[PDB]
């Protein structure tokens with residue numbers, strides 16, 4: 001909408017207070033004009049029609065329980081925009097400052113979040129498996145990263161290319177979580193998953209197998225559920241990324257860690273310059289090796305570490 005940029009205040013899903021960029025024109029709308037061509041957050045009102053209505057508020061204060069998922073979807077989209085711009089010199093998901101749109105309160109008891117080809121969408125959860133999913137910064141960045149992937153490598157959402165698509169979203173979701181630097185970890189969704197169980201998460205990148213996800217290519221899922229295991233076999237790539245950054249010895253193979261920032265540079269370059277819609281795990285290894293060679297040189301530790309990490313997870 002046309003209006004003037006304003007700054008509201010509210011509380012997110014976990015009860016934390018934060019400022020949000022809004023737009024005033026009769027109402028205060030969740031429209032952040034400070035980033036690209038805008039970040040826009042909508043109310044889906046417990047229905048499945050999208051996007052719903054641009055979020056409107058009478059007083060620019062967002063402390064109601066019903067407001068909390070919108071506050072976080074809007075704020076964490078801003079953080080994710082900042083990460084891609086400041087760290088990778090990428091302007092929104094399309095590289096040309098496309099407007100970023102999110103809807104919250106999607107459906108009833110909806111235990112998921114998604115990118116629908118045009119926008120992000122967040123359920124409220126059923127209060128048992130999830131609380132409102134925009135409360136997880138890693139979740140928000142996971143979803144926006146699907147948009148980045150769709151505009152770049154275009155990895156098809158099935159089998160190995162789809163597991164790479166998923167891992168890219170978990171990797172950058174985690175790197176955004178570290179960028180914001182509030183309780184960062186290598187787990188996925190811990191802030192919104194299972195409010196009655198402490199210390200768990202939807203997935204683990206540091207130890208995927210804690211939930212039965214594979215941590216080696218010889219344990220990959222080969223069936224048809226989950227689009228051929230895209231959220232399962234992602235563990236193999238998540239583990240490799242974790243090893244590249246943090247190091248470790250895994251199935252007897254030692255990896256010298258090179259840190260999160262170099263992991264992000266290598267995988268961002270792989271995603272945007274080398275991967276294609278049909279890339280498999282072996283082709284991802286080759287893309288990461290070439291990306292590290294471009295950035296750091298063929299004789300570099302960074303290249304050696306990429307090879308060690310894929311060796312450790314059984315990907316040649």
Ligand SMILES: CC(C)C[C@H](NP(=O)(O)[C@@H](Cc1ccccc1)NC(=O)OCc1ccccc1)C(=O)N[C@@H](C)C(=O)O
Nearest residue numbers: 112113114115117133139142143146150157165189202231
């Ligand atoms: C991080 C976690 C809290 C949420 C995360 N959801 P997500 O993987 O982003 C998923 C959502 C979805 C919902 C409904 C139908 C299909 C898919 N896909 C998705 O948005 O694809 C976007 C895409 C991919 C490829 C090409 C175009 C577009 C997830 O790990 N969900 C688990 C529980 C699961 O669904 O098993």
Ligand SMILES: [Ca+2]
Nearest residue numbers: 057059061062
């Ligand atoms: Ca209000």
Ligand SMILES: [Ca+2]
Nearest residue numbers: 183184185190
């Ligand atoms: Ca965390």
Ligand SMILES: [Ca+2]
Nearest residue numbers: 138187188189
């Ligand atoms: Ca996390």
Ligand SMILES: [Ca+2]
Nearest residue numbers: 193194195197
């Ligand atoms: Ca939990």
Ligand SMILES: [Cs+]
Nearest residue numbers: 201202203211
């Ligand atoms: Cs789990």
Ligand SMILES: [Cs+]
Nearest residue numbers: 222223224228
């Ligand atoms: Cs399969």
Ligand SMILES: [Zn+2]
Nearest residue numbers: 142146166169
């Ligand atoms: Zn996903």
